[PDB]
């Protein structure tokens, strides 16, 4: 989302919001304000995505090798993109 030609989908989302905004306050149905909530929720999803946590099973004893990494990253995704 953030990398595809510097995030034109954000401009698409704000265009879908200003489709609602151009209507007057009295003429706006609650579905249009729900579309505004959809756009604001989309921006909170774009911001709010963070790398996950590394969960281990502690029923068995930890061996002599121990934890070698806690990296939870996809192949093409780096920490700079996130």
């Amino acid at each position: 989302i953030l990398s595809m030609e510097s995030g034109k989908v954000l401009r698409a989302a704000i265009r879908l919001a200003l489709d609602v905004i151009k209507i007057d306050r009295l003429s706006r149905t609650p579905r249009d304000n729900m579309v505004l909530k959809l756009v604001l929720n989309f921006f909170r999803n774009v911001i709010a995505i963070e790398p996950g946590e590394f969960t281990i099973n502690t029923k068995k004893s930890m061996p002599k090798k121990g934890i070698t990494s806690i990296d939870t990253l996809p192949p093409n995704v780096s920490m700079d993109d996130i």
Binding site: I14, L18, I21, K22
Partner: peptide
């Protein structure tokens, strides 16, 4: 410092036109 919505529409259309 109030931010107008019509100013944001005008800036959106103008930066669509030339983007500076």
């Amino acid at each position: 410092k109030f931010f107008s919505k019509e100013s944001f529409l005008a800036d959106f259309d103008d930066s669509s036109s030339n983007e500076d």
